[PDB]
Amino acid sequence: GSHMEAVQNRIVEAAERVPGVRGVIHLRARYVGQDIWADMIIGVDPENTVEQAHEICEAVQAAVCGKIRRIESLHVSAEAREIGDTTKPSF
Amino acid sequence: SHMEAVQNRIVEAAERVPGVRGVIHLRARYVGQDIWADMIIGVDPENTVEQAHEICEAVQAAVCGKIRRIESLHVSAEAREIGDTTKPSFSDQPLSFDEVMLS
Ligand SMILES: [Cu+2]
Ligand SMILES: [Cu+2]
Ligand SMILES: [Cu+2]
């Protein structure tokens, strides 16, 4: 709880540096023992191809799971998001 | 095991929605009396994210409408060629307490 703000910021920070990510729409996370379980919605170009979005989800999984190692489970789903949209994550 | 009848009922409903080229994966599980499920459907590879999402919404509508003991359904789309068969892969693995609390 106290420490859940920091891991949320580390995950958003890592996710948004991935090419093809237009921001993190939603992220919920929970500790289980020492490891983090989280599910995240990333925003993506609405006109990307389904295959292109699956690559971006896949790359987001590698970069967040790779930089933060207290994560045991991360579920990433992709959603269309317009280029002008600047809504910050909600958590 | 015990999930077989509803798992096939769900695949049946999904595959009748236009634009679904078969159901790739389906996991369904009870949480109390309510069913929680997630599935991956195969869609035309040049579907845009926007076009595929409409198929997902239409798949959520047909399944959540036909079965109604479904409390949660997650649908994701993945590229699948028109000639591809490969019958759906099923899982019936239960939800941890923490997973339910995640949502
Ligand atoms: Cu893949
Ligand atoms: Cu998913
Ligand atoms: Cu939707």
UniProtKB/Swiss-Prot annotation, chain B:
Location of region: C-terminal domain (CTD): 4-103
Record annotation: effect of changing V49P: CTD dimerizes, binds fewer cations. Loss of magnetic response, still stabilizes MamB
Induction, per UniProt: Part of the probable 17 gene mamAB operon.
Effect of D38A: Slightly decreased wild-type magnetic response, fewer, slightly smaller magnetite crystals. Significantly decreased magnetic response, many fewer, smaller crystals in vivo, isolated CTD does not bind cations
Organism domain of life: Bacteria
Compartments reported by the entry: Magnetosome membrane; Cell inner membrane
Keyword Transmembrane belongs to the record: yes
Effect of disrupting the coding gene: Single gene disruption has no growth defects, no accumulation of magnetite, forms empty intracellular magnetosome vesicles, decreased levels of MamB, mislocation of MamC in 1-3 foci or rarely in a shortened chain. Magnetosome vesicles are fewer and smaller, aligned in a chain with the filament, only a few have very small crystals. Other, possibly precursor magnetosome vesicles are visible. MamI mislocalized to cell inner membrane or in 1 to a few patches.
Effect seen on changing V49R: Loss of magnetic response, still stabilizes MamB, CTD dimerizes, binds cations, dimer interface is tighter and twisted
Residues that, per the record, bind Fe cation 2: H53
Principal subcellular localisation of the protein: membrane
Keywords, ordered alphabetically: Biomineralization, Cell inner membrane, Cell membrane, Ion transport, Iron, Iron transport, Magnetosome, Membrane, Metal-binding, Transmembrane, Transmembrane helix, Transport
Consequence recorded when altering E78A: Nearly wild-type magnetic response, fewer magnetite crystals of normal size and shape
GO BP: iron ion transport
GO cellular component term of the entry, any: magnetosome membrane
Resulting phenotype, M39P: Severely impaired magnetic response, cells make very few, small magnetite particles, less MamB and MamM protein accumulate. CTD no longer dimerizes, CTD has cannot fold properly and is unstable
Binding sites annotated in the UniProt record for Fe cation 3: E78
Binding site for Fe cation 1: D38, H74
GO molecular function, one term: metal ion binding
Its biological purpose: Essential for magnetosome formation; required for stable accumulation of MamB. May nucleate iron crystal formation. Probably binds and transports iron. Binds divalent cations, possibly up to 3 Zn(2+) per dimer in vitro, probably iron in vivo. One of 7 genes (mamLQBIEMO) able to induce magnetosome membrane biogenesis; coexpression of mamLQRBIEMO in a deletion of the 17 gene mamAB operon restores magnetosome vesicle formation but not magnetite biosynthesis.
Further remark: This bacteria makes up to 60 cubo-octahedral magnetosomes of about 45 nm in diameter which contain membrane-bound crystals of magnetite (Fe(3)O(4)).
Family: Belongs to the cation diffusion facilitator (CDF) transporter (TC 2.A.4) family.
Record note on quaternary structure: Forms homodimers via its C-terminal domain (CTD) in the presence of metal cations. Interacts with MamB via their CTD. Isolated CTD forms homodimers.
Domain remarks in the Swiss-Prot or TrEMBL record: The C-terminal domain (CTD) is probably responsible for hetero- and homodimerization; it assumes a V-shaped, dimeric metallo-chaperone-like fold that can open and close. Val-49 forms the hinge between the dimers. Binds up to 3 divalent metal cations (probably iron in vivo); upon binding there is a conformational shift to a tighter dimer. If the CTD cannot fold correctly the function of the whole protein is decreased, suggesting the CTD confers functionality on the transmembrane domain (TMD), perhaps activated by ligand binding to the CTD.
Protein name, entry field: Magnetosome protein MamM
Residues of the full protein shown: 215 to 314 of 318
